[PDB]
Amino acid sequence: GARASRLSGGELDKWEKIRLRPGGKKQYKLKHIVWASRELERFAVNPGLLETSEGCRQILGQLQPSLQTGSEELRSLYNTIAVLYCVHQRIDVKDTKEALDKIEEEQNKSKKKAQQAAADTGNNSQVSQNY
Numbered sequence: 001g002a003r004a005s006r007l008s009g010g011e012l013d014k015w016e017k018i019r020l021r022p023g024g025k026k027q028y029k030l031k032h033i034v035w036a037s038r039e040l041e042r043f044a045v046n047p048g049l050l051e052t053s054e055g056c057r058q059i060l061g062q063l064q065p066s067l068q069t070g071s072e073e074l075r076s077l078y079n080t081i082a083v084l085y086c087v088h089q090r091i092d093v094k095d096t097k098e099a100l101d102k103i104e105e106e107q108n109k110s111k112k113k114a115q116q117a118a119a120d121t122g123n124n125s126q127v128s129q130n131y
């Protein structure tokens with residue numbers, strides 16, 4: 001509800017320090033912070049999620065199950081929020097890919113706990129029919 005954008009020169013230093021490709025020289029720029037904040041608005045997702053380490057990671061979860069059938073737009077976001085999430089969790093990524101393989105390790109910390117509960121609560125299969 002405040003002035004446009006939230007990050008500043010300080011954070012911009014790290015945001016621009018991240019490379020877009022694994023073996024390339026391209027990096028992230030404001031162009032993305034704007035495109036993302038806007039994209040989410042179209043994905044029924046509020047841009048106010050980029051202002052929280054827990055908010056970003058959460059966003060990825062929504063597209064996680066959509067990665068199988070996600071357009072070029074959804075795919076971008078996933079790779080985007082993944083780069084920002086590290087910016088708020090105090091993580092230095094070498095590139096887009098590096099970030100992914102990075103956040104995946106952070107989830108394992110919670111998976112170990114979710115398993116203790118899964119032993120009691122489990123999911124079932126799905127199936128429908130049409131004439």
Ligand SMILES: *C(=O)CCCCCCCCCCCCC
Pocket residue numbers: 001002004005006007015032033036037047048050051084
């Ligand atoms: C008030 O209406 C709250 C919403 C304003 C916050 C939007 C700022 C988005 C922050 C950009 C994230 C940086 C992407 C790397």
